[PDB]
Design a protein around this ligand. Structure first.
Ligand SMILES: O=C(O)CCCCCCOc1ccc(C2=C(c3ccc(O)cc3)[C@@H]3C[C@@H](S(=O)(=O)Oc4ccc(Br)cc4)[C@H]2O3)cc1
Ligand SMILES: O=C(O)CCCCCCOc1ccc(C2=C(c3ccc(O)cc3)[C@@H]3C[C@@H](S(=O)(=O)Oc4ccc(Br)cc4)[C@H]2O3)cc1
Lengths: 11, 235, 228, 10
């Protein structure tokens, strides 16, 4: 889980 | 997908409203610049810009229709290109200077504080003067920046269906550029010529990103963890 | 004034077609050294014909020698790559380096770090194939690479010639029966692929000036030295 | 100087 992945996943 | 149901004007409105703000650096004018501190300033700035860029990308029509894996790949490939085209845009009306932030406006002599960065500075400055001569408009800029996001990683991805949607969106952005130019009074020949002139500049933006990226993963040899992950994706 | 700007679109196409360089052969189970030997020797012979071809691109001869040198130094690997991708169009999954040197990605694995470039090249070839790129469009795109890739590292004459080539590409699409919308859509699609060709050249160049193995000629060495 | 010079003039 990359940081960019989480940030794109945040909601 | 709702992105393919947008009119041309609705596309421009979506992109304009999604624009990220212009951030300030920590530049203290009294502190004498060094290589470490200037790179510190650019690095801190870019790191804060990345957070806004990620939330801007979510608002580019079509982008969130892609899988998360694809969204990650496009941003990893395009992030420095996108930072660079924004820098070049806000620097248009400052000849011979790059407007990194409203309080950080640098010429090429100060770019020599970081050995090897002046070559990139000159290329950025040249791109900025190119935009100025063309009188690039804010509506055209946001189209170009959205093209960079969707285009720059689409060739390094069972699933052609993902690449097909991105191409249909990219086609919609082309229609929108032509639409902008036709409203500006340009003839048909002028419309196709300007469209080509603008997309060829994307080749020089790719070049600058690659040359810059090459130096950034040699500068590795204070950065935050997102930028480090962004940088490592190119190796 | 330059004679290139008076050419009609049919005159521009025929001149570019007539300027096309010849297809070259390579020498008649690859190691890493033998693989790079074949490719380096082939690229070296192609460079000589590329320079002749460049002299015949309308408007190129009107530039000074300094400007001609800069464009070719900036663009030479891009120009080799679009040539390779074009030849490989009808060979899905393979790169037609020469008529006697058709390779797949598995053979690309023989040289450590080339399979990444090979896959990008294959992807571009298949993109051109799915688009049904015509040879008349190809010679326009290759001339655009020559004139565009270094124009911003120096200009007015070059941008007028580039406009002429845009007019020519649109003329080719109109002649092919495409609507107005399909014309500008296709124009953009082709020009965006040029950004990927720039990327491939950059990544390839990065590798070529890391391995200093095979007997690269002095011309090829000076052409590589321009990117360091 | 440069071999590219001779090839562009010959
Ligand atoms: O792991 C560790 O220990 C840390 C290593 C990771 C640090 C990441 C830094 O991260 C970055 C550092 C610098 C930048 C930059 C810019 C920028 C910033 C914001 C913006 O809006 C637009 C452009 C502009 C354009 C680039 S550039 O191509 O010049 O880089 C260059 C090029 C040559 C040299 Br030599 C140096 C930098 C640089 O200047 C970008 C990211
Ligand atoms: C000393 C100087 C030596 C000069 C070598 O000189 C060269 C060596 C290899 C080539 C090549 C090609 C080529 C040749 C002819 C042609 O018509 C079109 C493409 C294709 C595309 C490049 S490439 O980007 O893959 O490079 C790579 C990339 C990664 C590795 Br690891 C090795 C080479 C290479 O494969 C080109 C020049």
């Amino acid at each position: 889980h990359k940081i960019l992945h989480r940030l794109l996943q945040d909601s | 997908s709702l992105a393919l149901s947008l009119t041309a004007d609705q596309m421009v409105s979506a992109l304009l409203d999604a624009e990220p703000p212009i951030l300030y650096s920590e530049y203290d004018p009294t502190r004498p610049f060094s290589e470490a501190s200037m790179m510190g300033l650019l690095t801190n700035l870019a790191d804060r810009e990345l957070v806004h860029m990620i939330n801007w990308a979510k608002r580019v029509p079509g982008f969130v229709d892609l899988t998360l894996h694809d969204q990650v790949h496009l941003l990893e490939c395009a992030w420095l290109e996108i930072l660079m085209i924004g820098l070049v845009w806000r620097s248009m009306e400052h000849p011979g200077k790059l407007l990194f932030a409203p309080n950080l406006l640098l010429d090429r002599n100060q770019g020599k504080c970081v050995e090897g960065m002046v070559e990139i500075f000159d290329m950025l400055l040249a791109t900025s003067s190119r935009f100025r001569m063309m009188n690039l408009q804010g509506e055209e800029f946001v189209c170009l920046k959205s093209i960079i996001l969707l285009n720059s990683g689409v060739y390094t991805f069972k699933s052609l269906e993902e690449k097909d949607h991105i191409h249909r969106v990219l086609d919609k952005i082309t229609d929108t550029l032509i639409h902008l130019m036709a409203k500006a009074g340009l003839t048909l020949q002028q419309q196709h010529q300007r469209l080509a002139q603008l997309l060829l500049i994307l080749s020089h933006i790719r070049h600058m990103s690659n040359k810059g990226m090459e130096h950034l993963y040699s500068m590795k040899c204070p950065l935050s963890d997102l930028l480090l992950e962004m940088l490592d994706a190119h190796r």
